[PDB]
Amino acid sequence: SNLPVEPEFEQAYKELASTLENSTLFQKNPEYRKALAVVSVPERVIQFRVVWENDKGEVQVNRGFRVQFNSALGPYKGGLRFHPSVNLSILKFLGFEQIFKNALTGLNMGGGKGGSDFDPKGKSDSEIRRFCVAFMTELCRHIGADTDVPAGDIGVTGREIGYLFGQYRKLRNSWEGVLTGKGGSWGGSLIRPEATGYGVVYYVEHMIAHATNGAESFAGKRVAISGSGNVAQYAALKVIELGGRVVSLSDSQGSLIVKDTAKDSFTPAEIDAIAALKVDRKQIAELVTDAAFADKFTYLPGQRPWVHVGAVDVALPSATQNEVSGEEAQALIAAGCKFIAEGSNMGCTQAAIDAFEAHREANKGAAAIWYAPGKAANAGGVAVSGLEMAQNSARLSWTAEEVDARLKDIMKSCFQNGLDTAKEYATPADGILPSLVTGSNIAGFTKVAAAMKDQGDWW
Amino acid sequence: SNLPVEPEFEQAYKELASTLENSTLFQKNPEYRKALAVVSVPERVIQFRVVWENDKGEVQVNRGFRVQFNSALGPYKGGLRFHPSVNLSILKFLGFEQIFKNALTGLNMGGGKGGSDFDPKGKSDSEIRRFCVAFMTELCRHIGADTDVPAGDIGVTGREIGYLFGQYRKLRNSWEGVLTGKGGSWGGSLIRPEATGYGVVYYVEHMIAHATNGAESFAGKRVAISGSGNVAQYAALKVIELGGRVVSLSDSQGSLIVKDTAKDSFTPAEIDAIAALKVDRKQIAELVTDAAFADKFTYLPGQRPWVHVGAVDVALPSATQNEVSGEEAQALIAAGCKFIAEGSNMGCTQAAIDAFEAHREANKGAAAIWYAPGKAANAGGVAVSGLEMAQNSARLSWTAEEVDARLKDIMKSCFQNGLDTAKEYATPADGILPSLVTGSNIAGFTKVAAAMKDQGDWW
Amino acid sequence: NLPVEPEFEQAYKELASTLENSTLFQKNPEYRKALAVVSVPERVIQFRVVWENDKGEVQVNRGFRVQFNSALGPYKGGLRFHPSVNLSILKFLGFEQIFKNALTGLNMGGGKGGSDFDPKGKSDSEIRRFCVAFMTELCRHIGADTDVPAGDIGVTGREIGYLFGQYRKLRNSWEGVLTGKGGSWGGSLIRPEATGYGVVYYVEHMIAHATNGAESFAGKRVAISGSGNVAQYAALKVIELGGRVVSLSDSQGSLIVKDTAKDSFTPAEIDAIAALKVDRKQIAELVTDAAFADKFTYLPGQRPWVHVGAVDVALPSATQNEVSGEEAQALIAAGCKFIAEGSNMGCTQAAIDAFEAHREANKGAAAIWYAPGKAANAGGVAVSGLEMAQNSARLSWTAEEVDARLKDIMKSCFQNGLDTAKEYATPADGILPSLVTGSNIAGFTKVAAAMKDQGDWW
Amino acid sequence: NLPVEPEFEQAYKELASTLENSTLFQKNPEYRKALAVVSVPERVIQFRVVWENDKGEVQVNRGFRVQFNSALGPYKGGLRFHPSVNLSILKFLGFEQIFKNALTGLNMGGGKGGSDFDPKGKSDSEIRRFCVAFMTELCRHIGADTDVPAGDIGVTGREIGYLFGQYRKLRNSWEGVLTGKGGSWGGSLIRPEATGYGVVYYVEHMIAHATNGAESFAGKRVAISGSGNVAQYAALKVIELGGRVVSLSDSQGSLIVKDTAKDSFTPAEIDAIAALKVDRKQIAELVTDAAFADKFTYLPGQRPWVHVGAVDVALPSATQNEVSGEEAQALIAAGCKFIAEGSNMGCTQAAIDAFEAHREANKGAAAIWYAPGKAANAGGVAVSGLEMAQNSARLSWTAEEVDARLKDIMKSCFQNGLDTAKEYATPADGILPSLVTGSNIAGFTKVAAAMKDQGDWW
């Protein structure tokens, strides 16, 4: 060809094509291979020079980017990354994946990603404000509430969303849902901190409902969680609300586990204390310096929770990538684990995923461990961005109760899109649970592709 | 300096600064003094020539104005005034106050004010239409549903909102929530006539709930109302709905009071009759020409209701400015009055306000009379403007029931913002009710100020 | 209910007075309605300007743009960054711009803007940051067909640069949105020389009418004040025409030729004053050299008028209100016969009233003839219109082409003011027509008439 | 983390090198900061282009627009439809356009765009469909004050037509949004002749400086390559000036006069090569007639340089990289003293380094003098600016008016490059100043300086 070398993007494309080729989609719909060629070239890319002033009064140059990849199902939606590795290949990879994740939710959102090679590390607040102002001066003309609604990602938190929103308001002279992850007083949504964690649990509550034909739920279930950030904390609290017991949490240095995994659970106050050590970036281990905690928990330095919990029913890896091995996957299966969902991204290794799915194909219905990818089950952050834009449109804020109930419905849509897509295009044997991984890898594309066809984007 | 002389604006600024300096806000947040310098200079002022034609075919010149003061929490929101005194000083004063009132509600609304030195007095309907058309020809380019949403005020009623909306539609070729107080068939909201009056009562129903830990409500309470316009009429009807008894109403010429303040109440039919005398601009006194009314009410010419009602529990001044003196405030306290809220603006004199708050600091909890300023408790008109814009956005009209329930929730937000701000920055002694006047004077600024900071408008 | 704007109210009052004291409202009585419409600005934008100083502190200033009148063209007029700036002062300066711009004969409306921002003590980076903040809001109200601002006190080529570059980044368009631009990004030749040449061009036409062609600048002694581009190019033009330049001055004092009867500044001397002024130095520096100190007297703390001896022409080219009523009577006693301004509002009202009373009392060439700034000072504003014209043609005209159109403009301006005065302010036979009243009427009727045609009034 | 863009990175590197090897950064050290800012595009738009071929199949191509720099004007530069097109190649071509456009002295920024769409084998209807699809997205980023694209390889009058008509339908505006337009819908006279005349105009100025006016084109033997509008109008100009044209060529071979010492192509011969080229025919066809075959030798598979014998001037007017380092040393050995390009990037870097080393080793008229394309090749881009100027005037100038402004432009371009070289790349006494280094510096400092004034860097 003459095409640029884009290894991250070429790999994302190959992965999706590889999933679609392996299913029955092109056997039944051979013409959808054309959809694949079309969708894989972004509708629009803006690259732009960002000049800004540092604390020493010195001119600085960075590169700014917005990949507006697809808008068949709604306006471009997707995060901004401020990281010195950022380039078009990486944003094309992330933006391409964001199309199909947003689509998988059921919400009217396209896909996109942007950001900068700007490095937030070592920068003052004012440097971050000056760059945000310089960045949004160009970006403003390509985005807006009905066109493209960016959000946070690596190096873009509430602080940068703040500065970017202010500059947009000042340029466009308009108050609108142009960004998500806004502050609560200026168009933010309630249930945003809780979105991903709560969403993980609503997703698996849909899995438990389906697998067990309604006979079981989270009430009395033993849940092994890993990690202790946003996702782990709010997933724990939702499990407790639904009458489940969380027997573990972990940070990078070890696992905190209830000594009695038959009886006991983290309480909401124990989660608050964990939350208050994380803010002050201390180790979970530190809690067993007090007398109350030491009596109720074992701390296991350097250890993941999976082999140490005993009999468990649900596993919510919510710490990091590749945090459940093939081995500790067998250990969960052996322990009678029936539900595992990724709070984290790519949380399960290929070996762990293979073990779960091998088990799903050799065990009928409720006797299978059912695995759900993060793409599907950590989509709660995405769902609540949709609800922030919905609230912004009418400029009327919902109650926590209204936002929570809609997030649960949206997670039921993520679950049902995955289920239905598996049943059509990766049809399981009689009595076998459809593959929530294959379902979820395919569901996005088929909706985007049929929509592009209806809209004349391919024929 | 070189600044223009703006006595009304300099006074509004001094009053807010004086409230913030007297609290603990700058002791805990000294950097918010910068927010004060920034917020006090409007983001944008448009002044513009208005040329229009009178009934004699003669050219007329007036001045048109829009102060777009603040938009950190939403699009500019605030009334239009057509009055021969109008100038930039007065609109800056009103627009500045509107920022913090809208903010106090919890709704995503900035603040603004505009209008004209045009004098509606003696003008024909067609003159008012010609001026409205000439006025909106310039104003249209600076406003719109997501930018700036004006409304009514002195000299701008449904009639002028009508003409202004028509001209905007004709200029912009768009149907949108660009104005509030619209006609019911063209984007108006239900519960608009009832907004302020109903809102007054929902606010105090929140005060009664808090003060009495839920043990009391409006059911069986004796309520002294003054005035007989919109506010008094709908406040009365809401009190009756909630099982309360309204023992009084008044116009400029005297007070109509139930002869038996232990037993009796105005009924909804007696309010209809009062409403039908007001439309035909007659005096409440005139009702005691009939036999039924004379038997049930005493008319007291030239008298306010406050000393003449006996034992009363709630007082809703809803007539005019400075309509409850220091003296008639002691008389309400002595009568066991525990709740007073301003339906009217500045309804209580400084002396009355001081008496209420002196009583609040010397009496624990439910034994205090609790006073709420109009800024807080008459915000129902503002709340229903928010709900009109919400309905306009989707172009789907709510039921009276849906609008009423949301107004009650919004009034609970006005109440809670005032409470929480008092508890933080004017912390009462143990067992003392937080100051709803101080709370409500501060709550607006702290939300606008922290939002400006998040958005980079000051640092 | 109106706010008190002294400066504006004064300028409206003296314009009213010039029109009342004429045949205008006798012949066209309906034109009284136009004065009341013209006097209220079509549009005013006031805005918050938040910017960051070199210590990283948040600073807050007020931005303004007065869009006074657009009957004859897009709004046009300078920006002023000065701590005295307010709406009152900009309305006053903007009201004037309407009639100045009108008198060039080009399609330019009138306006004025700026900020109470104080350039004094500010670094180049603080100015760049303020200019970025300022244009961020201003950009949505202005444009090459809407409103084309320019420089003034505290807004030089430097600020015009930073304002242009921010307008270009935000609007993503390269257009004649601002005048006074650099030679390589839409600037005009003759732009440095425009006001100074223009006042001389105008005065040339005065001397020809007053003497029926019998005198010129040739052999005239010319007192000039100031030492900037305006005083420099006014002097170089006087010299080219055979006149003698007897004075220049800066803020700290005057530099006068010892022999004001026969002697003169040279182009070489002018070049060295300009050399000093790029280096921010005083003209006093020069009588420290022996050659200059023999030719010239330095007068600390003085303007030149009282100190030049007998003189024929005065061109105030320094600052506003630099010719008092007393200094005007001194110029009359020194035998001065022609006075027009290189500086914006150089002459006080007391000075203008002295000149006009002298003109009414002295037949023909015996009178001192004053021309108002809206006519004689319009050389820069004229070349600002030719800069717009060059930007819209996408070409840069030669210095000779710009200069040719400038000469033509200043002649049509002189002629309009004289002919208007002869029709509506008909002087006593042998009295020089009022170029004060002629120009005021000429500029007011051209605006008022176009407003009528366009339905701004009836 | 940056992507590898060889072409771009090479062009940045050789520009850096020319600036380092000079007094520029000694005199103006702060200008180093500008090189790093100028080198990153202000804006790049990449977009999907979906279109339908003659079998009704969906096709997908990549569209680009690089908006490199707009300090000096709206973005300006051609579109290329060629299957090799990518962001790297367009950045390279766009970076060059900044400095080419700057050197015309008109207000034009720089840019470049196009598509990997392959016109080869495509019908007129497929091209129309692709042009409609392409402009459908491109239109929102471009405009007569924002970005004015033009033709290049694979984008001829035909594509400019279809692009213009789609822009007009979508934007509902008739404006100078594109250059290279047809004579009846905003096109310019001299647009066919612009690049060929322009290279000759520039070379005229070279021969005059190198010989201090003692030689001209008169009696010069001129080897030309190519047979398009550029080679045709370059030849007709050389002939008008008394020069002799010894070669033309197309892709399949050269056509050389047998007697390169004394003989020449005629205007009549040029007319017939142009007759053939409208009919898509080879220049080889011509020595099948007896008259031509006696006058001329055809050389299959050859460019002319090695084959012309002794020659005085070389004008490569065919394609990029058509003068290797070897062919450059052959031109030096044949006694060639002046070389400039009619074709975009005709000379290889190896050729340019040979010419510049020869210039540094040979005093005065003994040196071969090479002029870089950004200076000598800017005739088309110049007339593109005059096409914008005509569109904004709403007039069509005569051929003589367009030609007059073109001569003036190419003279100011030559003079800027010579004077810049004499200031910052001062040659050894009797050495010809580097028009390579002079032009590079001249074009970089005009852009860098306007960027500074406008606050793009400090």
Side-chain angles (χ1 to χ4, degrees), chain C residues 260-261 263-281:
Chain C
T260 72
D263 201 355
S264 178
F265 288 85
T266 71
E269 298 167 344
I270 311 331
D271 287 322
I273 280 140
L276 260 36
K277 252 59 179 100
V278 44
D279 280 354
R280 306 298 285 273
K281 286 180 171 176

Side-chain angles (χ1 to χ4, degrees), chain C residues 124-125 128 158 161-162 164-166 168-169 172-175 182 184-186 391-396 401, chain D residues 42-43 70-75 106-107 144-146 386 388-389 392 397 405 446 450 452-456 458:
Chain C
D124 173 56
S125 283
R128 162 175 57 83
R158 179 186 47 275
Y162 298 141
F164 182 78
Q166 185 70 9
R168 154 161 79 81
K169 310 312 151 42
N172 184 34
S173 157
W174 197 108
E175 78 196 45
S184 70
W185 39 282
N391 295 168
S392 321
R394 302 183 185 288
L395 298 168
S396 312
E401 292 176 328
Chain D
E42 292 176 13
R43 187 182 304 98
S70 69
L72 295 175
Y75 307 108
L106 305 170
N107 286 132
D145 298 321
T146 287
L386 301 179
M388 296 163 56
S392 321
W397 304 334
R405 291 181 163 289
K446 185 183 300 294
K452 192 183 204 280
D453 292 353
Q454 297 176 30
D456 294 357
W458 61 90

